[PDB]
A paper describes a structure:
We recently identified and characterized a fused toxin–antitoxin system called CapRelSJ46 that protects Escherichia coli against diverse phages. CapRelSJ46 contains an N-terminal toxin domain and a C-terminal antitoxin domain that normally binds and autoinhibits the N-terminal toxin. Activated CapRelSJ46 then pyrophosphorylates the 3′ end of transfer RNAs, which inhibits protein translation and restricts phage propagation. Here we discovered an additional protein trigger for CapRelSJ46 in the phage [name]. This alternative trigger, Gp54Bas11, is a small protein of 66 amino acids with unknown function.
To gain better structural insight into the interaction between CapRelSJ46 and Gp54Bas11, we first solved a crystal structure of Gp54Bas11 to 2.3 Å resolution. This structure showed a small, six-stranded β-barrel with one prominent loop between β-strands β1 and β2; β-barrels with this topology are very rare in nature. The closest structural homologues of Gp54Bas11 are five-stranded β-barrel SH3 domains (DALI z-score of 3.8), with a 310 α-helix replacing the additional β-strand. Thus, the structure of Gp54Bas11 is significantly distinct from the AlphaFold-predicted structure of MCP from SECΦ27, with root mean square deviation (r.m.s.d.) greater than 14 Å. By contrast, A7 is disordered in the complex but is part of the β-barrel core in unbound Gp54Bas11. The A7V substitution may have stabilized the unbound β-barrel, which would also have prevented activation by preventing the unfolding of Gp54Bas11. We verified that the G24D variant was still properly folded because it had a circular dichroism spectrum comparable to the wild-type protein.
Residue numbers in the entry: 3 to 66
The structure:
Amino acid sequence: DQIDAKVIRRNPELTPGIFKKGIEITIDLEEMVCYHSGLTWKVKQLTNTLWSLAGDEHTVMEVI
């Protein structure tokens, strides 16, 4: 119900230091969020291995 994902693309408009390329993020599959920078971000599934922030599609995470 939880998966570890790697940030592979990040929106350049994001604050420097948030969703750095290469870090491991944990995604809660039931509620479809990821925990990062003390916040709960909404994520959506693009493919079985690729995920993006629900609103910011240009920040993409890859299942590890």
